[PDB]
Amino acid sequence: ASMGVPALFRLLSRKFAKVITPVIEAPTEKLPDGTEIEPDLSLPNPNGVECDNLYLDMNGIVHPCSHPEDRPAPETEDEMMVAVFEYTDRILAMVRPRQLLFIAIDGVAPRAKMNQQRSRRFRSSREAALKEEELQAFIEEAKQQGIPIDENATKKKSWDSNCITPGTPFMDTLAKSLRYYIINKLNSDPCWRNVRFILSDASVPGEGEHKIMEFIRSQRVKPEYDPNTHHVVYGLDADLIMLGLATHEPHFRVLREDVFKEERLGIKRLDDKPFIWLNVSILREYLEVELYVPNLPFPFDLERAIDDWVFFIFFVGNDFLPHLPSLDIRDGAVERLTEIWRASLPHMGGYLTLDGSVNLARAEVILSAVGNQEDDIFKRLKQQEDRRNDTVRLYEPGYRERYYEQKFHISPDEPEKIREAVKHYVHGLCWVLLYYYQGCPSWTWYYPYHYAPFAADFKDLASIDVKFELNQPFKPYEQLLGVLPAASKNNLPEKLQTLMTDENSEIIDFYPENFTIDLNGKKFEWQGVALLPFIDENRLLNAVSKIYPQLTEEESKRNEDGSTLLFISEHHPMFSELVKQLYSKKRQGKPLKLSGKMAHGLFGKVNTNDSVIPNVSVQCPIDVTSADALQKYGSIDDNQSISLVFEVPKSHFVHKSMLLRGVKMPNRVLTPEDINQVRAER
Amino acid sequence: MLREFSFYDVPPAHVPPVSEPLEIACYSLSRDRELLLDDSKLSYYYPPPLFSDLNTGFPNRFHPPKSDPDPISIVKDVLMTKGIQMNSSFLTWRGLITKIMCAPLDPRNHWETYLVMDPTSGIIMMEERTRSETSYANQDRMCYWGYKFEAISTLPEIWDACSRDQIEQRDNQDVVPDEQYCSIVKINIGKSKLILAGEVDCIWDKKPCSENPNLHYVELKTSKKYPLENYGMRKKLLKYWAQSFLLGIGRIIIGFRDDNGILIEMKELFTHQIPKMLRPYFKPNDWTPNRLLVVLEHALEWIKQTVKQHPPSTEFTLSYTGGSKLVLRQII
Ligand SMILES: [Mg+2]
């Protein structure tokens, strides 16, 4: 289970205050005759720092656009896209990328991620059904009481958020609209003429976040890459800043919106947004002061220290692994793990982590120190919890047996089932670190429990043989079945829907309407573990294989991989030389490798986009309602740009967690006062 | 005959036109002091950690460099094996032009070269034959600091193609300055066409496919840090500029060290940035990049015109032993 956004942001606001910063947007000039002067976007950035490459986690834009604050939900795909276009426009105006805009829509994710998504969506669906019952019973009572409920405003037509998933018709709309949007930008403001646009849509496998990071790694590795590229990533995942550190590009910041019975049901009666920067370079400064250990028998390496810090944070729980029972970020687990790491490091032989690999002997050192403390941790927690005015009883002797029997259904008679649980968790830890640093090591691997073993049980780790079966990303329709609850059936091809709803479906057991949520530390149901069955992948694959031959050719095409696209202006410096080499008589079918002066700092392989017909007239794929939006999102009669299928380069080598040569470090921000505070706190 | 050329007697003139140094050939040298016609010894820039002790390995892991000067026939032989025609006025080592060019800056640094016009091609070939004054300090601790800095700042392959052990174990490598990569260049200075050969410390990124590679090349220097108000520092930077300018080297990276040989700071410069950077700190009567070029062009034309008044295969000696004059002697 993930730590969450409020949790990491509170840790950042508490210990790393200077990393968070308000985004400055240049104002519109408003003249007394209603003339409005939009700021010139080619001018310097009011934030002082210029951006080269802007990367967008597009689904982190679609979601907020689906439930706005003072502008209730859009209902139509067309309405949705106008909102998305406007939100994106705002980001482009505040960020002002000079070299690249990378738009990443989530493609099929690895099984480990799919399981987190399955749990979340099952819980959201359960939450929404429980709300719907309560709301309708409230409305019935209000009718009989003579209270005039505004039923149109109360019964809100909510955007089906489950359509924001690879393989749905809306994903085709999103892709087509964003293709247009790119072509628009390339044929409008002159400031986007020198900007290259990449679209990585939902038919390209991988989380949007990770496709961005994998792109960064693929470019870093090229000798002619600019070692002082300024990166800005927009995304909402709590993960994002961890990925930013993992990148080892110091010129890096995250863009995000500033996080800092009648009410909950949305009852309405007839008679009744700033953004923030998260500066990863400033985070690196903090961690240098935080993680430096004197008199080591091996060289101190900030890059190695940062990686360790990214790794031991996995213990507090993320998308792919449950938190260890004794570790909670709210209870200062990150600070506790940092102190254990600092104390262990001099005698440990080296760093926990090596370019995405885990030293299991060293992991055991960290975990043993946690395991020695947990008896007391569970006692302290209960002691503090009683200062406010279950069956496991962690604060009470014998809890090991009760926890494993109640949560894992392991009797004290079966000690090898605990060992199998820790083996699985260890695999998980290695899976996540390789995922962050080298790429997904297994598209099928998952942690097959809802709870973690105690840290005390992480003994003899070095003897565990960690291996992964890479396999392949699941087909879009397989991910949908691996992720959706039965109530979201509408998002699948009609012939595949029956697998979730029909009593006689081979795999009906994967889709129960009713399931238990275990509180495991009483709070509320959102602070809980959903006890869902884990899908048997073979059974799911065999079930779809019988129905696949009955899908239309279009449904089948929607189940296959598509391409990443590169859009460049005809006025771009690279254009004329790229076209000469591309339409050259060496071969017009073989991909063109971007190299020499021609590449202009972008690397990979390009080929022609065959789907595009050489008619320069391009129209908007969706309808627009307002007169101002029809003006800014209209037809493009002369498309002065080309689109190309684009493939990132792939290194034959392990990517190293090191700074590039030529790296010129951003100005130091932490004052005597800042460094003082960090010293005393640790 | 004996002829003298005064650095002072040169009138104010426009800076001579200087062409972009074009690489026509390259080669590698090994530790056994043999030559190979390939990119074998080409290296890539990757920095060491700061506070690196540049003494490490002196002298136990130190392969002292050759002390006798290389005959210029070496370069003539390379070019002819490759079937490259020599249609220029001078063939020499880049370092020998630097010495002529920078002589006015260094009255203490004495030197002598031998000059012969080839009867077949008409090219004037220049070399040293006697062990140079500078080479006598070849294996001093402070010279080692420079060789050490080069060893811990370069890689055999691009960064990504190197293991992290390869990078992190560089402090434990033998320091072998005889192992080098070299570039042979055509460069025009005024009416003089020169073919020059010199060591290339490493490359910034990689050698372009065939684009001229020299702007991708890097020179590595070690020095004590002083402000630009310090004349000694300006003079050193001017001499750094002159050397790299002559082979069209794009970047100079200086490892600034303290008195005990510890690397405290590194500074990246574009070669062509140096003149502008020094400009504000120049006072009247100072040697500037342009004045050094004017006086060099005049020196080269004076040598050419003198040598051409005599039969081919006449040996000449060019000496600087301090003062404001170069001395050119015909050997009988
Ligand atoms: Mg050097």
PDB file of N, CA and C and ligand atoms in Angstrom, chain B residues 150 201 219-221, ligand 1:
ATOM      1  N   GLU B 150      45.348  13.287 -15.622  1.00  0.00           N
ATOM      2  CA  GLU B 150      44.908  12.750 -16.912  1.00  0.00           C
ATOM      3  C   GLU B 150      44.463  11.287 -16.801  1.00  0.00           C
ATOM      4  N   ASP B 201      44.479  14.731 -25.309  1.00  0.00           N
ATOM      5  CA  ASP B 201      44.280  14.116 -23.995  1.00  0.00           C
ATOM      6  C   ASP B 201      43.070  13.203 -23.915  1.00  0.00           C
ATOM      7  N   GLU B 219      41.792  19.288 -23.800  1.00  0.00           N
ATOM      8  CA  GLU B 219      43.121  19.339 -23.187  1.00  0.00           C
ATOM      9  C   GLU B 219      42.950  19.355 -21.671  1.00  0.00           C
ATOM     10  N   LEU B 220      43.744  18.558 -20.956  1.00  0.00           N
ATOM     11  CA  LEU B 220      43.681  18.536 -19.490  1.00  0.00           C
ATOM     12  C   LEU B 220      44.890  19.212 -18.846  1.00  0.00           C
ATOM     13  N   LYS B 221      44.631  20.151 -17.941  1.00  0.00           N
ATOM     14  CA  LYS B 221      45.707  20.880 -17.270  1.00  0.00           C
ATOM     15  C   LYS B 221      45.585  20.787 -15.759  1.00  0.00           C
TER      16      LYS B 221
HETATM   17 MG    MG C   1      47.522  17.921 -20.856  1.00  0.00          MG
END
